[PDB]
Amino acid sequence: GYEVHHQKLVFFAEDVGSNKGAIIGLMVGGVV
Amino acid sequence: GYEVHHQKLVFFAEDVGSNKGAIIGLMVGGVV
Amino acid sequence: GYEVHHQKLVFFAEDVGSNKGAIIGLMVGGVV
Amino acid sequence: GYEVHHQKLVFFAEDVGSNKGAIIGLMVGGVV
Amino acid sequence: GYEVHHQKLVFFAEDVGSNKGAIIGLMVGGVV
Amino acid sequence: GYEVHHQKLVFFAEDVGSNKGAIIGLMVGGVV
Amino acid sequence: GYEVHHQKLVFFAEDVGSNKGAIIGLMVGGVV
Amino acid sequence: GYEVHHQKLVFFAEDVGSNKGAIIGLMVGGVV
Amino acid sequence: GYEVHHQKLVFFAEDVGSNKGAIIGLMVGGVV
Amino acid sequence: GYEVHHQKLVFFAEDVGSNKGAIIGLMVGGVV
């Protein structure tokens, strides 16, 4: 199991073509 | 299991073509 | 298991073609 | 298991062609 | 297992062609 | 422009996890 | 422009994990 | 421009982990 | 420009870990 | 420009770890 606590994020993605993979600010234990 | 605590992130992705891999600010234990 | 604590990140990715690999600020125990 | 504590990172990737490998600020125990 | 403590990093990657290997600021116990 | 003429193909894909890239018998001028 | 003429292909892919790159029998002028 | 003529291919890929690069029978002028 | 003519190929890839580079039977003018 | 004519190839790759470079039967004018 897991926990994610206090966080601040402001990301921008301005021009993404064919993302088939991943663009992540914070990726915690994911799969993609 | 896991824990992620206090964090601040401001990333920008301005022009990404065919990301099939990954662009990550903070990747913690993920797969991709 | 794992823990990630206090962090500050401001990364920029301005022009990424075909990332099939990975561009990561902080990669902690991931796979890619 | 593992721990990552207080950190500050500001990286920039301005022009990346075909990264199939990895560009990482701090890589801690990852695979790539 | 492992620990990474207080760190500051500001790297820049301005023009990377076909990195299939790795460009890392701090690589701690990774694989690549 | 282009032309593809007489062809015979019998491919099998038995167990594909997370193909995010491509598995192609014959790839002629594509993108992926 | 281009032409591909008489061809026979029988490929098998039995166990592919995370192909993010490419597995191709015949790749003619593609990108990937 | 280009031409590919009479060809026979029977390749097998039995166990491919994380191909992020390429496994190709015949690669003619591609990118990867 | 280019031409590839009469060819026969039967390759096998039985266990490939993290090919990020390339495994090619016949590579003609490609990039990788 | 270039030409490749009559050829026969039967290669096997039985256990490849982290090829980041290249394993090629016949490499004609490629890059890698």
Give how many domains chain F has, as a whole number. 1
- Interface size I-J, in CB pairs within 8 Å, comes to 126
Which positions in chain H touch C20 (Cβ < 8 Å)? 20
- What angle (nearest 5°) sits at the alpha carbon of residue J24, between those of residues J21 and J29? 90
Q: Tokens standing for J2?
A: 């270039």
Shortest CA distance to G20 belongs to which of F18, E31, A17, D31? F18
Q: Is-contact B14 C13, C-beta < 8 A?
A: yes
SS3 sequence, chain A?
Answer: CEEECCEEECCEECCECCCCCEEEEEEECCCC
Provide the 3-class DSSP secondary structure of residue B16. Answer: strand
SS3 percent helix, strand, coil of chain F, rounded to 5, is: 0, 50, 50
For residue I3, the cross-strand partners are H3, J3
- Given in angstroms, what resolution was this structure solved at? 3.5
Check if the beta carbon of residue H17 is closer than 8 Å to that of residue G18.
yes
CA distance E20 to E23: 9
Q: Return the number of CB contacts < 8 Å for F and G.
A: 126
Helix (H) or strand (E) holding G4: strand G2-4
Asked if J30 and I26 come within 8 Å (Cβ–Cβ), the reply is: no
CATH code, domain carrying A8: 4.10.230.10
Q: How many CA atoms lie within 13 A of A11 on its CB side?
A: 23
What technique determined this structure? cryo-EM
How are beta strands G2-4 and A12-13 bridged, if at all? Answer: unpaired
CB atoms within 10 A of CB E16: 19
- Give partners of F (≥3 CB pairs < 8 A): A, B, G, H
Sheet containing strand D2-4, edge to edge, reads A2-4, B2-4, C2-4, D2-4, E2-4
Touching pair G, F by Cβ (3+ pairs < 8 Å): yes
Distance of CA G22 to the CA centre of its chain: 7
Contact list, H25 vs chain I (CB under 8 Å): 9, 11, 24-26
Which residue type sits at H27? M
Q: Which residues of I are known binding-site members for Zn(2+)?
A: 2, 5-6
CA A17 and chain centroid, separation: 17
Distance CA B18, CA G32 (A): 9
Nearest C-alpha of chain H: how many angstroms from G22? Answer: 5
Distance, CA of I18 to CA of F24 (rounded, Å): 19
Q: Which helix (H) or strand (E) holds J13?
A: strand J12-13
- Report the distance separating Cα H25 and Cα F26, nearest Å: 10
G contact residues 1-32, partner I, Cβ 8 Å cutoff: 21, 27
List the single residue in H with minimal CA-CA distance to J4: H4
Structural domain boundaries, residue D16: 1-32
Maximal CA-CA distance, chain J: 35
